[PDB]
């Protein structure tokens with residue numbers, strides 16, 4: 309997928325996670341987010357097409373998904389255990405990471 | 415290790431995983447695959463020696479191991495739990511990822 | 521944080537882990553190490569300021585944290601399970617990875 313299909317996959321599944329009722333549904337939505345975040349790590353954001361492919365800011369932009377992918381990983385494991393409320397809370401606190409990168413390059 | 419020693423480590427341990435009987439053996443072979451996949455992520459594939467070190471295709475080639483390393487991670491956790499059959503099935507479905515990258519740069 | 525604040529976070533938490541008594545304390549210190557190791561992956565080490573931003577040695581330097589981040593991950597999961605002694609032993613065997621990179625670029 310391209311960058312914004314991924315971004316609309318991170319967002320849709322955030323709402324799904326906040327509204328889910330069993331482990332399976334949270335586990336399902338986080339698994340999608342992780343694939344999306346990894347695929348996103350390829351792309352070149354609009355704001356940085358006018359700069360060099362290995363701009364430091366292009367490296368800052370890839371590092372931001374590592375933070376994100378590692379927090380989906382913790383969230384996912386809570387879900388695999390069945391601590392649904394804890395998994396829901398972890399997913400909710402991802403918006404810090406989404407919106408840190410957002411104000412830089414969005 | 416170099417690129418093809420790693421590739422022959424991914425392959426040998428695939429057969430090992432498909433033929434194992436306890437959690438320990440699957441866990442052992444997947445742990446080897448993860449080290450191999452990470453070490454592989456360094457290398458420069460033959461097909462891309464004649465292109466620039468930061469070719470997009472050299473970045474596509476490193477991204478492919480992330481997909482791979484993250485699916486070994488799930489497989490490994492099933493094994494740590496003891497769901498041997500589920501871990502065996504996850505390892506089997508890695509060949510999609512092996513052969514996606516393969517037709518591009520192998 | 522900058523590179524050496526991260527390095528002094530990896531070190532402080534190593535001692536903390538070796539001296540902890542419950543799962544929670546090990547889990548706490550490893551979680552800090554993982555954030556530190558990821559943040560460190562950005563930086564450019566002193567020894568390699570006088571070389572190109574995408575030196576192979578600058579790529580070797582980022583690969584070293586993957587090895588490190590993936591071994592904190594295993595350690596952390598032992599701690600989440602409550603195998604404190606096993607988690608303590610995993611953290612102790614990280615110094616191989618710390619000191620492999622150290623003799624290259626420290």
Ligand code: HEC
Pocket residue numbers: 311312315316318319322353354369370371372373376402403405406407409410413414
């Ligand atoms: C950088 C490391 C980012 C992280 C982490 C997240 N997002 Fe993101 N986002 C980023 C960029 C550069 C852009 C602009 C891309 C563009 O096409 O203009 C975006 C955009 C979005 C969007 C809008 C999609 C669209 O149709 O325009 C959404 C809905 C979005 N981002 C959501 C989102 C969520 C929920 C995140 C955390 C889970 C998240 N993003 C992380 C860069 C980055």
Ligand code: HEC
Pocket residue numbers: 417418421422424425428459460475476477478479482508509511512513515516519520
């Ligand atoms: C790219 C991201 C790859 C992934 C993921 C996997 N492989 Fe791979 N493989 C890749 C390249 C560029 C090459 C050519 C390297 C060369 O030395 O010519 C290969 C090669 C192999 C081989 C052959 C080893 C040899 O002696 O020539 C094998 C056995 C192999 N690959 C196996 C394999 C398996 C089982 C994978 C999934 C677990 C896998 N590879 C992933 C690139 C990539």
Ligand code: HEC
Pocket residue numbers: 523524527528530531534565566581582583584585588614615617618619621622625626
């Ligand atoms: C490279 C991939 C490294 C890994 C993995 C670890 N360290 Fe490291 N370390 C690295 C460099 C290039 C440097 C020099 C940076 C500098 O500021 O000079 C260091 C330095 C340290 C330090 C000293 C901090 C200071 O105030 O100078 C410490 C205490 C340290 N490193 C500890 C440490 C530990 C405990 C590690 C494993 C858990 C570890 N490092 C990994 C590069 C790399």
Ligand SMILES: [Ca+2]
Pocket residue numbers: 312316
């Ligand atoms: Ca949209």
Ligand SMILES: [Ca+2]
Pocket residue numbers: 326327328329
């Ligand atoms: Ca609900």
Ligand SMILES: [Ca+2]
Pocket residue numbers: 327328329
């Ligand atoms: Ca509901």
Ligand SMILES: [Ca+2]
Pocket residue numbers: 418422
């Ligand atoms: Ca061979």
Ligand SMILES: [Ca+2]
Pocket residue numbers: 432433434435
């Ligand atoms: Ca068998």
Ligand SMILES: [Ca+2]
Pocket residue numbers: 433434435
């Ligand atoms: Ca057998």
Ligand SMILES: [Ca+2]
Pocket residue numbers: 524528
């Ligand atoms: Ca110091």
Ligand SMILES: [Ca+2]
Pocket residue numbers: 538539540541
């Ligand atoms: Ca003690």
Ligand SMILES: [Ca+2]
Pocket residue numbers: 539540541
């Ligand atoms: Ca004590």
Ligand SMILES: [Cu+2]
Pocket residue numbers: 381385487491593597
């Ligand atoms: Cu895990």
